[PDB]
Amino acid sequence: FEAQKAKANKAVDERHFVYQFMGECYFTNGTQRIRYVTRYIYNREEYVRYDSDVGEHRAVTELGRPDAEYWNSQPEILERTRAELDTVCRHNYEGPETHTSLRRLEQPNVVISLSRTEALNHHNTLVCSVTDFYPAKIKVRWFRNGQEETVGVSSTQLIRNGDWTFQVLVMLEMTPRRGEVYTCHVEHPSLKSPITVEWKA
Amino acid sequence: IEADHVGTYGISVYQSPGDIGQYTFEFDGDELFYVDLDKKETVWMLPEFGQLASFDPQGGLQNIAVVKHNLGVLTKRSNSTPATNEAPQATVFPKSPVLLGQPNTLICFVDNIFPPVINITWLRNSKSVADGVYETSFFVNRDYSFHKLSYLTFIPSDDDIYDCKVEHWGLEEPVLKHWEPE
């Protein structure tokens, strides 16, 4: 599935300098709604921009007044850019994405571990390790003795690993009594039935 | 700025001096692929992803070319206004829960990077380690700065201590985020 790209327009006419240009495609409710914006940045400062909702290039700063005017004057350029809403955004979504990103699913690897040695009747800490999963949206809960609990529980927010796999950790503040068995429960679209890990105290 | 998904189909970055460029594609925040400006070839993060879709490198090459041009133009339009450096902040963690002996991966997440030129090396007991290291591209940040990730494959053992050594111009001296299996 050949993917398409946005085309930067030509600018009109020891210290470091950084330039950056990007084509941002915003898909609200799948392809149903699409907002397209291109940003031209020179030293962390956005100076010109094309907002799908404005229909043309606009100067965000005075440093971008030249470029904006010239690109809007030349019909060829303006239409080229404008059309990218379909030729790039819609095309990639309905094509490469739908058959690659939008349809990739990775199942988590849950495992329960306890901080300090099992000290019966002595407060300790239990942690649920949900790792390696995609997409993002996921839920986690702690099952003590058949009863879910919220108090004394905390989970680090989504930890993006960078390799298209996410991660999250949930700590349980309890006390390992005798007999009772703890179990972590997590809901993730990468699976039909909530995966549940158990730990006999 | 709200939406269910956001694809950045075309991210071109160009620096001067040094004549440094980067061209990538991003989706929901992860990197789909990047064009190797030297090898003139596309490189997908997920090799499997490269099996399903495709992208002509020239698309990135032409852009970089345009970006390089405009950089020269804007540098003048603002009479050589230089870029103010930043102090990058690192963070280290394992890809999965650590279990002594069981091979894992150490991740260093460096953020607030600007300009996009940094050295990120790993240290094993204060010793420079090479093999087993994979570095990503520069990801884009809303404030137009950048962020990068580096990965190291190791064998969990209390017998060793690690630290991510970050070297950047915005730092008075190299910094290192220490991390141990303790």
Epitope: E2, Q4, K7, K10, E76, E79, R80, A83, T87 | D56, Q58, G59, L61, Q62, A65, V66, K68, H69
Partner: T-cell receptor, first 111, second 109 residues
């Protein structure tokens, strides 16, 4: 505008030819096409700017060089008969959606 | 991305109807061009069309960007003897323009 030197030249097989091209109009991209019969125009090498050179559809046997911005030249080392034909250089702006050719160049690579 | 001029060579009497056929095939959204090359000189631009479905015309010629037929045929109503030359069809949905084989037009007085 754009001009090619030499306009025409003969060369012995195994030789070494160097086609030069120099355009006035500040164009970033430059191309080297080869005209024949039954193939019309075919791209050999192009360039997005100084220091740049990209492979066209038929790059085999040729080398390209973009030293300056206004100068792009095609280079044939071990020339062969199969490389005998007409060569048209072209300059144009980004994304090559607007290109201007030169007068042409007749090349004869005899056995 | 590839062009296809089925027209090997065309010859017709002055003030006739010229119709050179061209069919492309891309994976993108190419711009279509027509180049006229008069014997002796290099090829020059006649007309082009970036946006799909709509026609471009110049000095008596005109061609339509038909997506349904992936075609870009060249038309002329009163072909003068001056219009005798080689006509090239080209398309570019990337960084460089690819050309078709070519079609030679001989307009007899």
């Amino acid at each position: 505008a754009v001009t090619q030197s030499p306009r025409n030249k003969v060369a012995v097989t195994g030789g070494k030819v160097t086609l030069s091209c120099n355009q006035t109009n500040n164009h970033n991209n430059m191309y080297w096409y080869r005209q024949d019969t039954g193939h019309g125009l075919r791209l050999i090498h192009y360039s997005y700017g100084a220091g740049s050179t990209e492979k066209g559809d038929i790059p085999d046997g040729y080398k390209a060089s973009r030293p300056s911005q206004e100068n792009f030249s095609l280079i044939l080392e071990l020339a062969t008969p199969s490389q005998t034909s007409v060569y048209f250089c072209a300059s144009g702006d980004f994304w090559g959606d607007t290109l201007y050719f030169g007068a042409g160049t007749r090349l004869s690579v005899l056995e | 991305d590839s062009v296809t001029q089925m027209q090997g060579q065309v010859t017709l009497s002055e003030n006739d109807f010229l119709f050179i056929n061209c069919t492309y095939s891309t994976t993108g959204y190419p711009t279509l061009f027509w180049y006229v090359q008069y014997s002796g000189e290099g090829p020059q631009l006649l007309l082009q069309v970036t946006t799909a479905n709509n026609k471009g015309s110049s000095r008596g010629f005109e061609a339509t960007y038909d997506k349904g037929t992936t075609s870009f045929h060249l038309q002329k109503t009163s072909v003068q003897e001056i219009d005798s030359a080689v006509y090239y069809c080209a398309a570019n949905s990337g960084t460089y323009q690819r050309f078709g084989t070519g079609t030679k037009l001989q307009v007899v007085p």
